[PDB]
Design a protein around this ligand. Structure first.
Ligand code: CD4
Ligand code: BCL
Ligand code: BPH
Ligand code: BPH
Ligand code: SQD
Ligand code: SP2
Ligand code: SP2
Ligand code: SP2
Ligand code: SP2
Ligand code: SP2
Ligand code: SP2
Ligand code: SP2
Ligand code: FE
Lengths: 43, 55, 246, 31, 55, 281, 307, 46, 43, 55, 43, 55, 43, 55, 43
């Protein structure tokens, strides 16, 4: 099954690069939350 | 040469930002025209009451 | 009746407004289903029936009875393209454009598209050919405005394509509907009147470069134009706005 | 005391992003 | 979780990345505007009160 | 999913910005560059309205109301809770409406049709910008704009109108109303006439546009024709909105008094001002 | 800039066009009028012919007598002075009976008797024009959509001048015949009933009135945009769908996600316009009879804030 | 990184850079206006 | 995949040109933020 | 009496049944709402008095 | 015969089905009025 | 009464089943809203008093 | 077969299942009324 | 009840499951909103009072 | 037979899964009603 035309190995390729961006972006965000919590905690 | 590629990316971005700047400043001059006409008219004498209960 | 409620704040003006919301929901359902008499069922890009047909059902068929013996139309109904379409997918996913496989002006796709309309003239209420060359309707004459007949026809390339030799008039509506242009081989073409600018010394056709005028689909009879021919001509000219390159 | 414990939680979250990122890079070499 | 990569066999990345791009910018802008709406967290007013500016 | 005839029209190109980067569809909806812009501003403006409802402390959608800055804020920024949200939502509304018009221009190009639809929509945008931007900027305060609220914007219409007495006496407002009523008359007639031809008495053939011409000539001795009626319906709608914008741009900028007092210029024309009798003598 | 098809470039004039016969009683149809070159730039140039007959004469004579009765009252209010008549033309007013007379026909001619006489001629003129609008369609074998659409406007007009005065119990509730005075009546009506903006059927009536300008702008612009494909010939696009109708449908489908047909857009059109005066007439019929203060009614129904 | 450069095989760089120029300019204007709307940072009120 | 028709080597080259400008633009921005933070700090 | 049945040869039963059913429902609702708005026949208020439910 | 194209025998059948429903419905209505009258006379 | 089943030869079951379903929902929702409008029958406010839940 | 073209046996079965639904629904309704009447009489 | 499954010879399951999903969601939202609108049953105000979170 | 082109066995199959859903959903709704009734009786 495929609606997009990507082969399975192409989909694994694209996903593993996509997840690298997600974890990178979410790591940068945690440091921003950490800095803001250190400065002015919301709990 | 790599420099021609550096300048091509800059040129594509300046196309974008140039158009966005043309609309922004063109809007600001249209607002400016209505502000200039507001200054010419007797509005500060005859200034209307506020139409909203927030004031 | 002022202040009289059946319950709560529900007075006779509440009964009215709630009754209207029921009527409006019913009317909107009626209006949308009426508007599904053309173009449905919905299709996949391959042409198979789409699994999602939307929330409204098809209405029951109605039949129009056409004048001048031309039969009856039932809508909704079987509704094939009935012609080849020279397009190819640009993606395996749905929702992307389909690129022309050849020359889109001549294949008749995109803004150059045309429909397999009836290959007969449109008729007036008496059953005469509705649109005629003005020479073929003796009472007609240009009663005001710049008469274009005898003007050179210029393309968007700014070169002369031909000259105007007649106006084709809508008889019952009494309006100019096409200009007939005689090309540099003496064969003529019809131009849609809405696509041309009758300037003081020329007719300007902003959709076409002067070479593209030979590609205009030609009419088979010199004295009438069929609804199929109209669509081919009007589609072809409007396609030039996208596809006429400099 | 949610200050100190808050710091710890954010540092714990980042360790999961480290795991996931290295895991993505461990996939991305055509594993 | 080892089959979540099959999402790219359901959805084409050209549309998904556009959708996600707008989504993440929209979400971020609303959270900044919500905080700026809040006196406890409007950083530009916290600094004005801190530094005895116009408050 | 496609209409059964749609496929032959879904070609590339016609985009004004972005080339093929956004030249795709999402269901029925065409996207393009300005479709991305449209959805962003629409979603942001809607979400800031829901957040303003939280600050206001109501969830009844008919009481939700986003007020502009008070007159003390002039044309400067206000606090978000106190007029600054209205200002951002006004930016988002303008961004959404303009992007929507530009997205319509792209769809016109891809289908090869005239630009009449986005041009007509630009009149509605200018009437909006008259009320929220041009006239408040002329009068010198964002507080002369109307609030975003289902019923509270009617309070603004009422309070603005009665500032000048009965607002029926604004002469451009009278002309706008005349186009609005005449447009609604013509839309009733045009809808009915086309339907009466396509849906004749049971068993009869479809009528022709010759019958349409004949019915109105029999009824009123004139018939504007198939092309004339669509020109008329467009120009009546656009004239209504032009004279609406005109009636407001003059109100509170060059006219300040009771609008009823304007009509005395005719009464006091010197060849008849003093003639006894009538209503004014 | 290109041609927009808003004004014609060339006019052609054929013979006069006498129009379809069907079952029209052709003795009752006049000769054709003159051509107007001015009208020809925007629409058809031909004036006439017009059909008269029985409901025609009844309607035109009663309508003349309505107009003449008001005019003479204005000439009297002017004191027969032709200068004062033109100075005060918008200030003259034929007012209904005073409230003390109730619905009785006993009011003096100067205190409301001429308003009843004028209103009777208006009643006959408008209703006979309705039957004329029905019968002209019948003679051509057409649907009665135009007569049923006109009935929706008559409903509001009947509520304003007839039904609500009867239900309120005095002719003093009816509208005066006069330019500024019917405007003063409209303003006073809203003040007496506590801000008519908070009437929900006045809200609806405005929604359909704005929607009618919205929809005719959309439809007029659409048909002109596809007129280069003969899309203004809407009946042949209904019978034999061309590229004009498909491009029109796909513009709106791609814009807003749904679309009409060439026949079905005229159903949206007729209902959008009909609902203006249908909901309007209800909103006035409720005013004073059921609700005497719409703002306070709005407060009790969750649309205005409580005190 | 490793493979983030593959984004230029998904989206046509010519079009992306023009669209990114529009974004970055509007973002800059937005932030200047946020500050101009705030009393302690309105540099144009002199 | 390969929707744009760039080769992999063309994409690797262009991404470095882009990324070099990204770090330059953000470095200039940091200098502007550092200037503003000295003149009129927001924390 | 015994020969009214030919009415179904004049009128299409489908339209008659729809029209009758709508009519009878709206009439019934109208009558019940008149009774609910009449204080001497609102059963919900009669019962609340009888069983002393209000206080 | 008639206008609807319903036969004489079909009309006579359908009439019995309608009329027995009418008598059934009106019978329940009569009991409903009787109980309400006994409960609270309107005369 | 026995031939009531011939109604399905007069009317399309789909259109009837939809219209009957819409009818019963709006009827039931009205009757519950009438009782919630009735202080002696608003069960949520009856049980508030019974269990002294307010003030 | 009237105006829908169900055979008489389709009508008899569709009625039979419909009427079983009608009885089942109205049986629950009768219990709900009897429960609320015992709880809080409206007469 | 032996034959209720024949409903899928009448109605297309595609529209039924969509319409049923929308119905059930809007019904649940209506009830939760009615409870939030009721002081004796707004669980967020109940727990605010019980834990003295506003007192 | 029928309007949907589903055969009788297909209709029996689709009903059995629909009823598995209904009984599952109802059971969760029942437990939720008990919990609220134990927490805060409305009768
Ligand atoms: C104050 C008074 C105002 C008053 C507002 C004005 C009121 C007066 C005007 C009334 C206009 C009626 C509109 C109409 O006829 O709708 C049916 C028609 C049928 O289209 P179709 O093509 O034949 O069939 C549908 C489907 O085949 C289309 O293709 P596809 O399936 O591939 O893609 C789906 C579409 C959009 O479809 C939907 O969103 C689901 C169906 C919506 C039906 C709405 C009516 C019935 C349910 C109403 C309650 C639904 C409750 C959940 O494309 C996409 O989904 C792509 C993504 C973009 C859309 C994202 C939407 C995000 C969610 C936002 C909330 C949407 C709520 C509808 O079109 C559609 O279904 C899509 C319409 C989208 C715009 C509708 C705008 C009008 C207002 C909302 C609907 C009318 C109810 C007020
Ligand atoms: C201070 C003034 C009050 C007010 C008081 C009223 C009152 C009072 C009424 C309205 C009504 C209307 N109001 Mg309001 N209204 C106000 C504010 C507004 C605003 C606004 C932006 O503020 C708007 C847009 C509107 C809009 C409208 C319309 C939607 C509506 C009239 C519909 C119509 O077609 O009438 C025009 C159409 C007709 C009158 C029908 C005429 C048909 C007859 C048969 C024609 C006969 C012709 C005659 C014989 C002459 C023939 C000549 C030929 C040459 C032969 N109101 C404020 C709050 N409004 C009406 C309504 O329906 O309210 C619910 C109404 O009665
Ligand atoms: C100029 C003549 C008339 C006209 C024309 C017209 N309008 C048009 C068009 C045309 C030709 C379109 O092509 C376009 C369209 O697509 O129609 C379907 C449109 C349109 N006319 C619309 C509405 C509309 N037109 C109106 C009026 C008129 N439109 C004029 C009378 C009115 C009123 C009140 O008179 C309304 C409400 C839309 C249906 C549509 C434009 C849709 C659009 O812009 O979509 C993008 C934006 C969104 C989907 C949502 C934006 C959300 C905002 C960011 C937040 C809300 C802010 C808002 C200020 C709040 C207001 C609260 C109110 C209670 C005050
Ligand atoms: C659905 C709501 C809309 C609506 C609909 C509507 N109106 C309609 C119709 C429809 C569908 C018609 O079919 C009908 C019509 O014919 O339209 C052309 C009509 C109509 N709507 C009209 C007006 C109108 N509609 C309005 C509004 C509306 N109409 C709504 C917006 C308004 C206003 C204020 O908003 C007005 C003023 C008319 C043009 C027409 C009804 C004509 C009518 O009834 O006329 C009666 C009067 C006369 C026939 C004659 C009057 C006197 C003349 C001076 C003739 C004198 C002749 C005499 C022989 C002269 C002798 C002189 C001697 C001295 C020699
Ligand atoms: C390389 C580029 C270099 C650029 C150099 C810097 C240039 C900066 C100047 C820009 C010149 C033009 C500015 C406009 C005219 C002017 O002087 O105005 C100055 C006045 C201040 O008036 C004040 O003074 C007014 C009196 S007066 O005009 O001074 O006489 C008074 O009426 C008012 O109350 C008071 O606030 O402010 C404005 O007019 C407001 C501008 C609003 C722009 C944002 C709008 C946001 C709110 C919502 C509306 C959204 C609309 C969205 C549209 C897309
Ligand atoms: C008032 O309301 C609140 C704001 C409080 C509501 C809050 C509650 C709420 C609803 C929050 C919602 C949050 C959500 C849903 C957040 C989700 C975030 C996600 C999904 C983030 C994902 C980020 C992913 C990133 C940045 C991915 C980057 C990918 C990259 C860089 C690679 C791109 C692709 C390539 C280079 C191509 C790869 C390979 C080939 C062969 C083509
Ligand atoms: C109204 O008042 C309040 C708001 C206060 C309360 C009441 C509100 C209310 C009524 C709430 C109701 C909530 C409901 C109905 C919630 C339902 C939630 C559900 C059903 C959530 C489901 C989530 C599912 C997810 C996240 C699934 C994700 C799947 C993923 C990631 C994988 C997708 C599959 C593939 C990639 C495989 C593809 C396969 C191939 C072969 C290519
Ligand atoms: C390396 O690859 C990249 C990371 C560059 C791209 C990755 C792949 C990809 C295609 C991502 C796509 C992301 C998308 C689609 C993001 C979209 C973001 C949007 C829609 C952002 C919108 C921002 C809008 C702003 C900041 C608006 C500002 C407006 C202002 C300040 C008002 C004043 C401006 C004007 C008067 C000019 C504009 C006109 C009007 C009417 C407002
Ligand atoms: C409501 O929110 C507030 C307004 C309060 C705050 C905003 C909150 C928010 C959501 C902000 C989001 C910001 C984001 C996501 C910003 C992202 C910016 C990015 C991705 C910028 C990237 C820029 C890249 C550039 C400029 C690259 C250029 C490359 C070039 C030109 C090629 C190389 C060439 C050179 C180095 C030489 C250039 C040529 C010359 C002649 C100098
Ligand atoms: C607001 O109210 C007032 C205060 C004004 C008081 C007065 C209100 C008033 C006037 C109320 C009137 C109420 C009425 C008229 C109620 C009528 C109710 C009826 C007729 C209910 C019928 C229910 C029937 C049901 C639930 C039947 C369901 C049947 C099913 C599920 C099975 C369907 C059959 C099949 C699946 C078989 C298919 C066969 C084949 C061959 C495929
Ligand atoms: C204001 O009024 C108050 C709120 C106070 C009172 C309201 C009173 C009122 C009118 C209440 C109404 C209640 C009603 C009508 C409740 C109805 C409930 C129903 C019908 C619930 C049904 C639930 C069904 C479910 C959850 C179904 C699940 C289906 C699933 C999981 C999928 C099954 C399908 C398949 C697996 C596909 C099979 C495919 C093939 C090819 C065989
Ligand atoms: C040049 O001088 C000449 C004398 C030759 C001509 C002068 C012409 C002239 C200056 C005419 C002026 C006309 C004007 C200004 C007319 C204004 C009319 C307006 C604005 C009317 C507005 C509304 C009218 C309505 C709503 C009327 C409704 C009437 C109805 C529904 C009729 C109800 C009928 C009765 C109450 C009568 C009942 C009587 C009997 C016997 C049953
Ligand atoms: Fe039309």
């Amino acid at each position: 099954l495929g609606y997009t035309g990507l082969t399975d190995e192409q989909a694994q390729e694209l996903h593993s690069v996509y997840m690298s961006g997600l974890w990178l972006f979410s790591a940068v965000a945690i440091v921003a939350h950490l800095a803001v919590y250190i400065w002015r905690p919301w709990f | 040469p790599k420099t021609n590629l550096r300048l091509w990316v800059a040129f594509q971005m300046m196309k974008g930002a140039g158009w966005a700047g043309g609309v922004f400043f063109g809007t600001l001059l249209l607002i400016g025209f209505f502000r200039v006409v507001g200054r010419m008219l007797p509005i500060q004498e005859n200034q209307a009451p506020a139409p909203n209960i927030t004031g | 009746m002022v202040g009289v409620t059946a319950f709560g704040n529900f007075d006779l003006a509440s009964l009215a407004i709630y009754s209207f919301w029921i009527f409006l929901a019913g009317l909107i359902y009626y209006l949308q289903t009426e508007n599904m008499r053309e173009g449905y069922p919905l299709e996949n890009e391959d042409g198979t029936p789409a699994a999602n047909q939307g929330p409204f059902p098809l209405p029951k068929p109605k039949t129009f009875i056409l004048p001048h013996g031309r039969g009856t139309l039932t809508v909704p109904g079987p509704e094939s393209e009935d012609r080849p379409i020279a397009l190819a997918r640009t993606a395996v996913s749905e929702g992307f454009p389909h690129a022309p496989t050849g020359d889109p002006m001549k294949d008749g796709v995109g803004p150059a598209s045309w429909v397999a309309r009836r290959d007969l003239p449109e008729l007036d209420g008496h059953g005469h050919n509705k649109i005629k060359p003005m020479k073929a309707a003796a009472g007609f004459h240009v009663s005001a405005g710049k008469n274009p007949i005898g003007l050179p026809v210029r393309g968007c390339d700014l070169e002369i394509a031909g000259k105007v030799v007649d106006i084709w008039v809508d008889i019952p509506e009494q309006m100019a509907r096409f200009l007939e242009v005689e090309l540099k081989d003496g064969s003529t073409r019809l131009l849609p009147m809405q696509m041309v600018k009758v300037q003081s010394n020329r007719v300007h056709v902003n959709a076409l470069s002067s070479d593209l005028f030979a590609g205009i689909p030609t009419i088979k009879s010199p004295t009438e134009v069929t609804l199929l021919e109209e669509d081919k001509i009007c589609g072809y000219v409007a396609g030039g706005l996208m596809y006429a390159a400099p | 005391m949610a200050y100190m414990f808050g710091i710890i939680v954010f540092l714990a979250m980042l360790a999961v992003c480290w795991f996931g990122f290295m895991a993505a890079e461990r996939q991305a070499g055509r594993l | 979780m080892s089959k979540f990569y099959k999402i790219w066999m359901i959805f084409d990345p050209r549309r998904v990345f556009v959708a996600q791009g707008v989504f993440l910018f929209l979400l971020a802008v609303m959270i900044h505007l919500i905080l700026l709406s809040t006196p406890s967290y409007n950083w530009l007013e916290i600094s004005a009160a801190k530094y005895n500016r116009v408050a | 999913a496609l209409l059964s005839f749609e496929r032959k029209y879904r070609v590339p190109g016609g985009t004004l910005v972005g080339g093929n980067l956004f030249d795709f569809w999402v269901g029925p909806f065409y996207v393009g560059f300005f479709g991305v812009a449209t959805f962003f501003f629409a979603a942001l403006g809607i979400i800031l309205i829901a957040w303003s409802a939280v600050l206001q402390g109501t969830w009844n959608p008919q009481l939700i109301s986003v007020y502009p800055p008070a007159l003390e804020y002039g044309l400067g920024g206000a606090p978000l809770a106190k007029g600054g949200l209205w200002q951002i939502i006004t930016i988002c509304a303008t961004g959404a409406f303009v992007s929507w018009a530009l997205r319509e221009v792209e769809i016109c190009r891809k289908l090869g049709i005239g630009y009449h639809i986005p041009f007509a929509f630009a009149f509605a945008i200018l009437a909006y910008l008259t009320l929220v931007l041009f006239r408040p900027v002329m009068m010198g305060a964002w507080g002369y704009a109307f609030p975003y609220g289902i019923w509270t914007h009617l309070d603004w219409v009422s309070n603005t109108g009665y500032t000048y007495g009965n607002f029926h006496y604004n002469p451009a407002h009278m002309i706008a109303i005349s186009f609005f009523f005449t447009n609604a008359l013509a839309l009733a007639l045009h809808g009915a006439l086309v339907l009466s031809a396509a849906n004749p008495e049971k068993g009869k053939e479809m009528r022709t546009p010759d019958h349409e011409d004949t019915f109105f000539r029999d009824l009123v001795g004139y018939s504007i024709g198939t092309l004339g009626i669509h020109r008329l319906g467009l120009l009546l709608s656009l004239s209504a909105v032009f004279f609406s914008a005109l009636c407001m741009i003059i109100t509170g900028t060059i006219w300040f008094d009771q609008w009823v007092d304007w009509w005395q210029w005719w009464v006091k024309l010197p060849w008849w001002a003093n003639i006894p009798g009538g209503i004014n003598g | 800039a290109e041609y927009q098809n808003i004004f014609s470039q060339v006019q052609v004039r054929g013979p006069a066009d006498l129009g379809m016969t069907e079952d029209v009683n052709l003795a009752n149809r006049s000769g054709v009028g003159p051509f107007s070159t001015l009208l020809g730039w925007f629409g058809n140039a031909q004036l006439g012919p017009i059909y008269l007959g029985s409901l025609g004469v009844l309607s035109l004579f009663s309508g003349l007598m309505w107009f003449f009765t008001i005019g003479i009252w204005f000439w009297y209010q002017a004191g027969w002075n032709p200068a004062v008549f033109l100075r005060d033309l918008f200030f003259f007013s034929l007012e209904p009976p005073a409230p003390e007379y109730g619905l009785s026909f006993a009011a003096p001619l100067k205190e409301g008797g001429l308003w009843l006489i004028a209103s009777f001629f208006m009643f006959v003129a408008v209703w006979s024009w309705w039957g004329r609008t029905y019968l002209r369609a019948q003679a051509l074998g057409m649907g009665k959509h135009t007569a049923w659409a006109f009935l929706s406007a008559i409903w509001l007009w009947m509520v304003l001048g007839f039904i609500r005065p009867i239900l309120m119990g005095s002719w003093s509730e009816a509208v005066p015949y006069g330019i500024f005075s019917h405007l003063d009546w409209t303003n006073n009506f809203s003040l007496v009933h506590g801000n008519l903006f908070y009437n929900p059927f006045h809200g609806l009536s405005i929604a359909f009135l704005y929607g009618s300008a919205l929809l005719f702008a959309m439809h007029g612009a659409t048909i002109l945009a596809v007129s280069r494909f003969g899309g203004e010939r809407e009946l042949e696009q209904i019978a034999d769908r061309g590229t004009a109708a498909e491009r029109a449908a796909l513009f709106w489908r791609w814009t807003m996600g749904f679309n009409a047909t060439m026949e079905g857009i005229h159903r949206w059109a007729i209902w959008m316009a009909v609902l203006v005066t249908l909901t309007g007439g209800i909103g006035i019929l409720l005013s004073g009879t059921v609700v005497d203060n719409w703002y306070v009614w709005g407060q009790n129904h969750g649309m205005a804030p409580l005190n």
